[PDB]
Structure prediction request, 350 residues.
Amino acid sequence: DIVLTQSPATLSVTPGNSVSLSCRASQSIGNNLHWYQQKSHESPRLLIKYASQSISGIPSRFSGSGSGTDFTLSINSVETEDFGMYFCQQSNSWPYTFGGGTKLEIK
Amino acid sequence: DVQLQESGPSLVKPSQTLSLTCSVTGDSITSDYWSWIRKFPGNRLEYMGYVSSFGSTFYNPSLKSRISITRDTSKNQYYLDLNSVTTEDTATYYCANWDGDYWGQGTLVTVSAA
Amino acid sequence: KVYGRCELAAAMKRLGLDNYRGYSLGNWVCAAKFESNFNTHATNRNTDGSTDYGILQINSRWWCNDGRTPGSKNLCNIPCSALLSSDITASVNCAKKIASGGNGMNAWVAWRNRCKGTDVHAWIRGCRL
Prediction:
């Protein structure tokens, strides 16, 4: 199975500042990496499709990039409502697998 | 819009089957691919499986063979059946569409005796 | 747009099809060759009122909405016209959903007839990938 590993585990940033989260795959997954954010008492919301493809209604400060095994989710000037859990998930290989998440807290 | 919603019991005992339904709003279930995902306490998501347009199923090998995902098209429902459960099966269960655009809100189902 | 072989190969590689769900890149370059000869404007109407569209000839009964096909499922949740792009992203994204169906790539007649069971690597040799 493919294994996804995200770093760091917890990320602390001050509002208005810029961040970059990493998802890495054990072996290549092409561009078949999707990104999810998940707040308290809410289910996941799809932020970015296939590494870098934008999703209807997601705020443009969400950007995704990379390919192969190395992937990044960028948030441009994060906002108070942006704090929460972020997950990456692969679809190139069955079974589909999720990262262990990164926690986007305040400094 | 599209809206999904899980229901079923919230207590399960070991060796008993945990059963959930996912009721779909805003489309025909026969018009998409539908999935079951669970979250354990360590913020750990696991993809359980999905069902395609004509009922073809994909199960995660990690499920000890104990899974089935069926559906009732007339009811715009699909179901999760998970045989021989343990405390390890304690999780927050979500249905969602295969593209990940829409998820149920999630439902906590605990296993433990009770 | 009519794509060249390696050009199409390169696009499919960047867009994640090499070994997607275990199918090597040659599989998709092979399917497109025989589905549409690598042409994004390929269309084909069928007795059942449906139409195949694009470089992978995706059918409007099940996979896309064209406004005129009885009992459209629209499984890729897209207008069939989007599959007619010079840019193959929408075609690729939908083909991955089709390949994720029970049938895998056998969904494509052409692929089960002339790509399945052969040296699909042939379709990308000559290409630097």
